[PDB]
Amino acid sequence: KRFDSEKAGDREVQRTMLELLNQLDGFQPNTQVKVIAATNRVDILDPALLRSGRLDRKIEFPMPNEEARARIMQIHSRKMNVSPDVNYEELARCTDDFNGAQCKAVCVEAGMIALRRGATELTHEDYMEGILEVQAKKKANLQYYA
Amino acid sequence: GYDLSASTFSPDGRVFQVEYAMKAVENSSTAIGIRCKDGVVFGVEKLVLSKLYEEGSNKRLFNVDRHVGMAVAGLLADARSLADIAREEASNFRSNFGYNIPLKHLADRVAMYVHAYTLYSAVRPFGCSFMLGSYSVNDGAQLYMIDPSGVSYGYWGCAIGKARQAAKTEIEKLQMKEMTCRDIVKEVAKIIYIVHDEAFELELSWVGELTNGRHEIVPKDIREEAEKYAKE
Amino acid sequence: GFDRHITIFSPEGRLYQVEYAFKAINQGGLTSVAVRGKDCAVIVTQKKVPDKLLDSSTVTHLFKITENIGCVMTGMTADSRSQVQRARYEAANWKYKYGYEIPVDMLCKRIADISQVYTQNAEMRPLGCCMILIGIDEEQGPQVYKCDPAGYYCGFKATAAGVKQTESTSFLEKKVKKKFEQTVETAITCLSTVLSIDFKPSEIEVGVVTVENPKFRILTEAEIDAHLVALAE
Amino acid sequence: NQYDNDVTVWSPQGRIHQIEYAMEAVKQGSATVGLKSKTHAVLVALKRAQSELAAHQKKILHVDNHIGISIAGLTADARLLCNFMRQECLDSRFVFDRPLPVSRLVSLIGSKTQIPTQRYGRRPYGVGLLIAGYDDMGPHIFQTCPSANYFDCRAMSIGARSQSARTYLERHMSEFMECNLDELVKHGLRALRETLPAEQDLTTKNVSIGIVGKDLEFTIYDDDDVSPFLDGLE
Amino acid sequence: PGTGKTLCARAVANRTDACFIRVIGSELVQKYVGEGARMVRELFEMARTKKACLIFFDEIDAIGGARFDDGAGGDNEVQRTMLELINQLDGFDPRGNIKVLMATNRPDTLDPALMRPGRLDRKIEFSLPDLEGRTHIFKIHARSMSVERDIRFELLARLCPNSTGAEIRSVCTEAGMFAIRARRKIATEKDFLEAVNKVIKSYAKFSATPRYMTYN
Amino acid sequence: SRRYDSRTTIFSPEGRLYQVEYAMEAIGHAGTCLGILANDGVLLAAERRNIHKLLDEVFFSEKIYKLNEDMACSVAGITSDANVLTNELRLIAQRYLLQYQEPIPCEQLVTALCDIKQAYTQFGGKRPFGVSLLYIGWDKHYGFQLYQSDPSGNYGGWKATCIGNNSVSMLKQDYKEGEMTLKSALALAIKVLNKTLSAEKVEIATLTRENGKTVIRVLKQKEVEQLIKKHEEE
Amino acid sequence: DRGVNTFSPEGRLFQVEYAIEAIKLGSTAIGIQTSEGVCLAVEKRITSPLMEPSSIEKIVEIDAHIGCAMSGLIADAKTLIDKARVETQNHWFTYNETMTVESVTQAVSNLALQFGEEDADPGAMSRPFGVALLFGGVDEKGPQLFHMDPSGTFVQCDARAIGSASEGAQSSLQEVYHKSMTLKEAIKSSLIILKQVMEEKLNATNIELATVQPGQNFHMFTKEELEEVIKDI
Amino acid sequence: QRTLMELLNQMDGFDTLHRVKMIMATNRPDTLDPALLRPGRLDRKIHIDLPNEQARLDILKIHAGPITKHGEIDYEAIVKLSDGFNGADLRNVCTEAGMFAIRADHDFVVQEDFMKAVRKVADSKK
Amino acid sequence: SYDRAITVFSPDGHLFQVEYAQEAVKKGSTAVGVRGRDIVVLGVEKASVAKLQDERTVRKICALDDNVCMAFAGLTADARIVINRARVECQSHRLTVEDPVTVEYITRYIASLKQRYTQSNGRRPFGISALIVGFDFDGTPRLYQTDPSGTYHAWKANAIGRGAKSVREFLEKNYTDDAIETDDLTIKLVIKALLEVVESGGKNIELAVMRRDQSLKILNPEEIEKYVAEIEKE
Amino acid sequence: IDAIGGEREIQRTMLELLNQLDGFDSRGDVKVIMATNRIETLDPALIRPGRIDRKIEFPLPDEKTKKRIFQIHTSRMTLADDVTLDDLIMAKDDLSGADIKAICTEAGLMALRERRMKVTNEDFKKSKENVLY
């Protein structure tokens, strides 16, 4: 966004943005075309692109909550042959920092190591053991964590 | 990087280690407190994780001096810490001056304690909003609420937590001044069941003329009487 | 390196913490203007309750230091009560240590000096509140002072504090070169000409001291209501 | 990651950014399970053997005179915390001459491990205690945590992949408040026998348990005495 | 920066049954604004016009600096190149089958929305090899040199012991330089042990890989 | 915080001390005042700040400081620090008297000051004393002697060494080590200062004696106008 | 950088998992608990041959019936060996008996993870003790050896290897010990040192061996006893 | 910065343009050129400001006009409630309250729909 | 009160502050000693002290009390503190047991002191390295060489100065049994060992000998010349 | 290479001598010889004993190369009677490799202003004070 700009600055992205937000909420003829925006960061933005009208409801995307990750692990794993002896709820409540995108993965490389075993049918420890793979970052010699 | 230290201002005067502590109680459950002419009624939302926790696994309605209360919001470690030093503070008042502690002085004291604890890079701010409340025989139903910034205001129906954006509206539309606390114990469940939008195993405590300057978990009967405000 | 992080000297002077602390006193902004009378130092400030759920009696700025010194502060209200409690502490400590009740000037020198040692040492922020504080001594007239968060008390006739400080001191400068115990055309009218609300008697707090009665008095909606309906000239 | 100089700082959402990471540091520790009956509460721990062979870094500890613990995280920091808990439990034996109640015990260690979370340059006590004792009323059991936030729980499991032991133990709470010692500890070992990597046995070497409750001292069952607890096939 | 961070890239380029679009981290930083975003989208345009293709981003911390302020904005152009990169890695496509694989010596200077599964899952941690494996890598470099009759390899593992996988080749080449110097057609132990004195002790004064081990 | 400390007490990767050799470059900016000993006594020869009229009277100058009846010191580098330390070392001198009733043989004093100045560069995290001051003195044990020290901490007997800019190599082609005859030491001093000049912009001071007690003279004005005409060529 | 009391994005402390390293650096020591004693040995890695090899103390007797065997960052152990023997004679002083090995090992391992930057008086420690050691000792329970870590974790051990040969020598020791001493565990342990050999065929100048047997107190072996054993292999 | 030279040297010119008057409206006046700000190119710089309280109830009535209403709909608590809005934010208030009725299927709004409208706009900070 | 932990473990077990002290002793003088079986002998190639030094205060060779004496190598002002504390505790060990204090004990005190500065809060472990020579109650001319990591070794040459890896490999080559006589072959081996590195002893070398708990005698450059001449003649 | 005087262009540039040195292959690309005065300044990423192989360094002179390197330059000159080392070895208590180049150049030039190819070692002293003093 706009700032007090000595030697280098930037004005090209300024003109692209400032002509964007004036065929958006410049003069009147707005009432034909709606807009959808998506930004992973908000603190970078000046209220020019937030004039209550330029961009209506600033809808919040949180982390997927305590139940939702179990739902997403049921969604993506819909095509895979899953055992009836599965428990998506303990797959949720064990693993709670993820932003819903990794949970999609959890399913997909859970199936990948499920075929790395060679079985044509996945189990719970494929998921459970599939997690210990999303992050890992090693850290051995821990026969002492009691 | 004007962040990460409470002794450094913003370039527009806004100490970011305080407003990062303020959202750190906005990601925790509600705890409403409603004043009326015979005392102050608290009610805390509970977000019971597993069945493994029993009833009152974590107290969030502490008491301090046999009459003021501690509906807390944020980190229970920090809230429990300032709860017990509030106990020590009313201990030093009653031991020191004899007279039972008036609540305005306790809220100003704990308020300047948690404020003076946000002036140093050698400490973090607290991460717990909390509220007080009692009445002496000639005090009025005093309650106060204290932010992690350290500011303490006298309220009528203050509400802290995650869903305080919802909770402040019903307490505002509830008739505030002149009813005799028993109904509002019952009416507290209506606020808690509205603001819970998802086990909600709530918990209430008050101080009143049925208590004469004390605290009780409810006694235990409105838990099967204010539970009957389901379907609203 | 750490010019805008630590209270140390940047190049060309201008340590970048006190003006970052000056911008902290404009946060929100509940705004005091103090009026001085050759016999009466009145106090004015505006105070806005958010939602009719606050207790309006408990929210105030308007603190009482002693039986002769009142004060009002417009900074961030977290840093206010940590500063006014030390001023009460040094007032009562002056009366225990040196006999007579403290006169208004070196109280503001002393809290200006601990605010200095906030902005001299590192590892502490200079807390953002400025202390408009009035009071009468036996020798001189009523006085008024303001220590800033840098420690520069001045000795004022009529400044102001908070948001819209410059418009207020411009109005007072334009309305003091003409020559006021009643202070009816000066005290409230600085607020009603700066920010244009023409207040009902709720949102304004007024704290007077008089030479005939040096006890600091906070006024109520009856007498401030007569004070407001006296703006019908 | 400028939030690495970091038990003073806050992540901009709400996070304190490493004393939940100490909760990660007790997720990494070895698995255990405690539970309670209407009469006497039990503790069960499997002991990791990261060596030739050993006493397998003995987990459950004698603190007390019926307030026993079960550590799971750092071991030297655990021993420091149970010398604290041990010493002031004996101090309450000295002064008041009563058994120190379990709730005030776990609350004041919950205020003792809370101080380095507050101040500067001091790591939290990265150990998840699973303390259990029998005061005047029923035999309590408290998980506490390195985030200094204890839980008055019943039937809790903490450690490596202990969530599966919880989800066994959550759906078998109905046969608690009955189920005497001989059939209770079987019901806890078959709750522990899910955190193991799916190959068959709670051996007498690695399983050390502890019993506390009505009319019996907190009693440690080591390598030999766990052998009368034997059943289950899965 | 000692392990075969890329060496594995040369192996998967050595057998691929596919394309191999190497694109290293500063063929993207060309100094017209928006133009670095032009080359990235162009790269994915010619990538989609080949079935069963893949791509390799060497040294991707040349586009990092996670997402800075709006004051003295210096990384901004670099940002948008990276930004369109993570718009092409996941947004509005049947996506083809570009098996992207990326190798850098630096964690979270690369922000989120880049490491998140979808565009870079299964991250691989080429840690420094242990006592067992490190023998093996000089077993790779003992496929040469016409060494002595009996030579203790595991000794040479346990004398260096926390060096780096892609160095032990400096032990190899260095000790061969000692053997050619001393006009011998073979390689003894005391030129190996003379070499591990020379490229572990005397070349740790300035050469630093605890500096990047903190970064991991 | 550990982000804020300058970290003065750290070895370089080249092994040296960053804040110490920055003090050595502080000497080369401002510094003069050589010292010559003879078979007779020892003299300092010094330079003031500039030509700037606006200077009424110095009792002693800002350069030569009296320490005992038989010692004196001169100062290079930062003048704010050394004033402090010279009062500091002056204390040391007098307390040796209080401990021993001796006039403190000067090597004891130089050793003590170099130990405390080494202590400021050893720990405490502070900046070192940016002054390479030197000393002249006499004891009954040894002869007339001058020592010279630096902000690093080491010192020595430095028979004709100067400090500050434009570094003494000409003196180690001109000084006769056996006999020197202090009038010709004045002549060599105004030679070196004549290459690197009345008492507006010079400050020369001698140490001599009569009948056992030492005499520290600051060489009042007209003696400098004598020696400045004691040249023709040089 | 970051400080010492911080947790690592792997899961453990920084300074502890860095203190597991600088144990691969340094000499190798081994110990075997038997049913009638415990043998310790260390190849103390003499650098030059111009010199005296019998003053590299790596087998240190805590008491008459506790002998330790350190490695890694040598001479960092001397403060906690000092605490081991001072605690030992404090135990014998106040209680008039022998000790266990878990009481000295209990007492030393409390000092391992006890450091920090900003704490009490500067006689405290900054870095953790980067020395792994093991107390070979005989008790009234039995002969036993307790392998410590720099993390304060100590474990019961009967066959434990430290130093750079912590993988190959430990795996070799894993398959060669089950039964008892009968004089040949000390000859089947220097055989493991014989496989380890770095510079020299393990004569009686570069290895130090000492046994603790229940009949005697200890026996730090002299030269002719050592080369009496080396002649048998 | 040579286009601003032509625009600048025809705002100035060698006449005064003598009949035409240009006015310019922008955010960020603290990034404008000093040459274009010197009284002459732009003389009377007008500071349009956020609604104080009176202007707040003005905007609230004007955008609350054509939507159907109550009678004694409490504007004064809405205006009292939270300051620092804009005209766009107050038509955002009436837009969100009409949104509340349009997914909630009511007749116009209620007082709790303005009251639920402001307290979600007050959530929309930066 | 400065409390930053300086000497901290980096990755791969490398304690960088100590190895930076190892270059700090790699960038000093070139000290050397020989245990010559009835005598001990030192030597440290000194700089240009003849130009204008005082030879009395250029001493790399000091004396602790009477028999033990050391030659430091590195930073030459942090060493003098260790000299002073060695002399102080050496007098305390004359107070308790009243012996001609053994060389083992005082070098354990030096190594324990420097190891105590590799531990405390923010004080930069020393950049010195010693040659603790001397005797004991029964001859035994033991030599010791310490280290900035506080590790002392009882070796017999230990050339640990700046260009002394060549000297210690030379002394590895040329010290077996030819130097078992009184003084001449030993001192010839030392002056041969330092004449490997620099130039003639009329300006450079200085030595010190010690014989059977008496007469710590340094060698003035008139006497060193005779030995140098013999070596030259070879 | 020493990179001093935003910063990120220097960062990417160093990253491309880094990667463009050793990315995927190489022709006969020995000679990457880097001269440096500040080894502790540059980022230790260049040496993976792959990107930058075996490397060699030196102490400044010794006196043997003060003599042996002093007599190379003045071998071209004509001074013969009092070629010295007392004004050369311990004169500056180590004098650079260049300071002897500048002492030969400034020496012969300073005796060349007065127009003689003669052997004067007192003019050499005026060269010493003239070039480094």
Indicate the CATH number for domain B1-232.
Answer: 3.60.20.10
Residue numbers of G between 79 and 118 with CB closer than 8 Å to F? 117
Residues A145 and D74 sit within 8 Å (Cβ to Cβ): yes
Within chain E, residue ranges assigned H as helices are 7-14, 35-48, 76-88, 131-141, 153-159, 168-181, 192-196, 211-215
Q: Do residues I73 and I160 lie in contact, with contact meaning Cβ atoms separated by under 8 Å?
A: yes
Nearest C-alpha in A relative to G149: A144
Look up residue G175 and give its two tokens.
């398959």
Element (H, E) at D210: strand D207-213
Nearest to H48 by CA among H96, H97, H88: H88
Residue C27 at interface with chain H, using a CB cutoff of 8 Å: no
Amino acid at F95: R
Q: What is the C-alpha separation between B12 and C76, in angstroms, rounded?
A: 13
Give F89→chain J minimum CA distance, Å. Answer: 32
Structural domains in chain F, sorted by start: 1-234 (3.60.20.10)
Query: Do chains B and D have 3 or more beta-carbon pairs under 8 angstroms?
Result: yes
Does the distance separating the beta carbons of C81 and B112 come in below 8 Å?
yes
Q: Flag if J133 and F12 touch (Cβ within 8 Å).
A: no
In the complex, which subunits touch H with 3 or more CB pairs below 8 angstroms?
A: A, B, C
* F74, β-bridge pairs: F134
Strands C204-210 and G134-137: unpaired
DSSP per residue, chain C: --TTTSSS-BTTB--TTHHHHHTTTTSS---EEEEEETTEEEEEEE---SSS-B-TTT----EE-SSSEEEEE-S-HHHHHHHHHHHHHHHHHHHHHSSSPPPHHHHHHHHHHHHHHHTTSSSS------EEEEEE-SSS-EEEEEE-TT------SS-EESSSHHHHHHHHHHTTS----S-TTTHHHHHHHHT-----TTSEEEEEEESS--S-EE--HHHHHHHHHT---
Q: Is G67 helix (H, G, I), strand (E, B) or coil?
A: strand
What single-letter DSSP state applies at residue G42? E
Question: Given the DSSP bridges, would you call strands G66-69 and I31-36 parallel, antiparallel or unpaired?
Answer: unpaired
Contact G25/E161, CB-based, under 8 Å?
A: yes
Chains G and D touch (3+ CB pairs under 8 A): yes
Tell me phi and psi for residue A48, to 5 degrees: -65, -40
Q: Which of I20, I53, I78 is opposite residue F12, by nearest beta carbon?
A: I20
> How far is the C-alpha of G84 from the C-alpha of G105, rounded, in Å?
8
Nearest C-alpha neighbor of C126 from the set I213, E70, B7: B7
Q: In what order do the strands lie in the sheet with I208-211?
A: I31-36, I39-44, I208-211, I214-218
- Are chains H and I touching, using the cut-off of 8 Å on CB pairs and a minimum of 3 such pairs? no
* Strand partners of residue I32: I43
Q: State the residue for tokens 């009740």.
A: C101
E107 annotated ligand-binding residue: no
* Domain ranges, ordered by start, for chain I: 1-234
- Transcribe I36-78 into DSSP letters: ETTEEEEEE---SHHHH--GGG--SB--SSSS-B-B--SSSSS
Give chains near I: 3+ CB pairs under 8 A. E, F, G, J
Distance CA(G68)–CA(G131), nearest Å, equals 12
Strands I31-36 and G219-220: unpaired
Cα I117 to Cα I123: distance, rounded to the nearest angstrom: 7
The answer to whether residues I8 and G126 touch, using CB atoms and an 8 Å cutoff, is: yes
CB D178 within 8 A of CB D167: no
Please indicate whether, in this complex, the C-beta atoms of E76 and A138 are within 8 angstroms of each other.
no
Q: Which two tokens stand for residue E145?
A: 């040199």
CB-based contact (8 Å) between I223 and chain J?
A: no
* B97 at interface of D, judged by CB pairs closer than 8 A: no
List, edge to edge, every strand of the sheet that includes F43-46: F34-36, F43-46, F203-210, F213-217
Chain E interface with J: residues with Cβ < 8 Å: 1-2, 6, 9-10, 13, 22, 24-26, 29, 58-59, 61-62, 65, 74-75, 78, 105, 164, 166-167, 169-170, 173-174, 177, 199, 203, 206-209, 211-212
- CATH number listed for the domain at residues I1-234: 3.60.20.10
Q: Cα–Cα–Cα angle for I202, I207, I209, nearest 5°? A: 145
Q: Do chains J and I have 3 or more beta-carbon pairs under 8 angstroms?
A: yes
**Distance of residue D47 Cα from the nearest chain G Cα, in angstroms:** 12
Query: Using CB atoms, which residue from G18, G49, G75 is nearest to I150?
Result: G75
Q: Is D223 on the interface with G (CB under 8 A)?
A: no
Q: Amino acid identity, residue I94?
A: R
Please report the residues numbered 29 through 88 in chain B whose beta carbons come closer than 8 angstroms to any beta carbon of chain D: 50-54, 56-58, 75-78, 80-81, 84
Taking CA atoms, B156 is separated from B72, B170, B192, C57, H30, in Å, by 17, 13, 17, 11, 44
Residue E112 in marked binding region:
no
CB–CB of G127 and I15 under 8 A? yes
User: Per-domain residue ranges for chain D?
Assistant: 1-234
Residues in chain J within 8 Å Cβ distance of E29: 12
CB contact under 8 A, A139 and G11: yes
Say if residue E6 carries a ligand binding annotation.
Answer: yes
Q: How far apart are CA I80 and CA F110, in angstroms?
A: 12
* Assigned token pair, C86: 């030390």
Cβ H54–C52 below 8 Å, yes or no?
no
Q: H78 CA to chain C: closest CA distance, Å?
A: 9
Q: At what angle do helices F106-122 and F79-100 cross, to 10 degrees?
A: 130
Q: Which residues are paired to I42 by β-bridges?
A: I33
Task: Flag if I20 and F11 touch (Cβ within 8 Å).
Answer: yes
User: Which chain H residues touch A4 with a CB distance below 8 Å?
Assistant: 30-31
> Which residue on chain B is closest to C57 by alpha carbon?
B154
Counting Cβ atoms within 10 Å, is residue G133 exposed (0-12), middle (13-18) or buried (19+)? Answer: buried
**A90 touching D, CB under 8 A?**
yes
The whole-angstrom separation of Cα G30 and Cα G42 is 6
Neighbours of C132 (CB within 10 A): 27
CB F14 within 8 A of CB J40: yes
Q: Taking an 8 Å Cβ-Cβ cutoff, which residues of chain J contact chain F?
A: 40, 91-92, 129, 133
H76 touching C (Cβ < 8 Å): no
H12 CB neighbour count, 10 Å cutoff: 15
Least Cα distance to A116 among A125, A126, A124 occurs for A126
What residue ranges define each of the domains in chain C, with the CATH number in brackets?
1-233 (3.60.20.10)
Q: Could you tell me which residues come within 8 angstroms of residue F81 by beta carbon, excluding any fewer than 6 positions away?
A: F129, F130, F131
Neighbours of chain C (3+ CB pairs under 8 A): B, F, H
Q: Which residues pair with C204 in a beta bridge?
A: C46
For chain A, say whether E1 makes contact (Cβ under 8 Å): no
Single out the residue of F137, F22, F118, F130 nearest to residue F82, CA to CA: F130
CB contact under 8 A, G12 and A137: no
CB contact set of G145 (below 8 Å; sequence gap of 6+): G31, G32, G33, G38, G40, G101, G134, G135, G136, G137, G157, G158, G160
Amino acid residing at C52: K
Closest residue by Cα to residue F42 from F71, F2, F76? F71
Q: Do H116 and B169 touch (CB under 8 A)?
A: yes
> For D1-234, which CATH class?
alpha beta
Nearest CB neighbour to D75, from listed A125, A139, A146? A146
Give backbone dihedrals phi and psi of G29, rounded to 5 degrees, phi first: -130, 150
Please state, in angstroms and rounded to a whole number, the distance separating the CA atoms of residues D69 and A146: 13
Asked if the C-beta of D5 comes within 8 angstroms of chain F's C-beta atoms, the answer is yes
CA distance H91 to J123: 93
Counting CB pairs under 8 A, whether chains J and D reach 3 or more, is no
Shortest Cα distance from A58 to chain H (angstroms)? 7
Residues of E in contact with J6 (CB under 8 A): 74
8 Å CB contact between G59 and I177: no
F13/J40 CB distance under 8 A = yes
Q: What does E18-42 look like in DSSP terms, one character per residue?
A: S--EEEETTSS--SSTTHHHHHHHH
Q: How many CB atoms lie within 10 A of CB C92?
A: 14
Q: Would an 8 Å CB–CB cutoff place F125 in contact with chain I? A: yes
b/e code I94-122 from CB counts within 10 Å (16+ = b): eeeeeeebbbbebbbbbbbbbbbbbbbbb
**Of D78, D92, D88, D44, residue with least CA distance to D190:** D44
Written as six digits, the tokens of C173 are: 């400068």
CB contact under 8 A, D50 and A89: no
Query: Judged by CB atoms within 8 Å, which residues 122-151 of C form the interface with B?
Result: 122-125, 127-128
Q: Any bridge partners for residue D49, and if so which?
A: none
d(CA G66, CA G68) in angstroms, rounded, equals: 7
Please compute, for residue D35, the number of CA atoms within 13 A of its CA located in the half-sphere on the CB side.
Answer: 32
- Among all chains, which residue has been given the structure tokens 């509600």? B30
Give the domains, in start order, of chain G with CATH numbers. 1-233 (3.60.20.10)
